[PDB]
């Protein structure tokens, strides 16, 4: 039976070598510091892709 990816990978985009998350803590409270609200861009995931590179394999 084919390897079945699981669809928590609506949350990551394969760049050309590494993953790409979207930075957490978005909504539900903005009683929070102003230059920290300015941090809303995205980063590539760290080197814990060791623990997940058999889960997101067919997004390629």
């Amino acid at each position: 039976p084919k390897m079945k990816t699981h669809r928590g990978a609506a949350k990551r985009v394969k760049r050309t070598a590494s993953g790409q998350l979207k930075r957490s803590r978005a909504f539900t409270s903005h009683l929070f510091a102003n230059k920290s609200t300015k941090q809303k861009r995205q980063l590539r995931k760290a080197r814990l892709v060791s623990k997940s590179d058999m889960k997101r394999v067919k997004q390629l």
Partner: protein, 48 residues
């Protein structure tokens, strides 16, 4: 599975939607034409 601690794909939020018509042009670069001659045409019946 981090052992009861919720995994890495529960903290990160989801965004996007794909499409229903996402016309994917077959992107031929311009360098590949430097092989043939007579300059007649390039053609979706010939460039295949």
């Amino acid at each position: 599975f981090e052992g009861g601690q919720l995994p890495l794909f529960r903290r990160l939020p989801k965004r996007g939607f794909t499409n229903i018509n996402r016309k994917e042009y077959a992107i031929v670069n311009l360098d590949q034409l430097n092989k043939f001659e007579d300059g007649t045409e390039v053609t979706p019946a010939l460039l295949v």
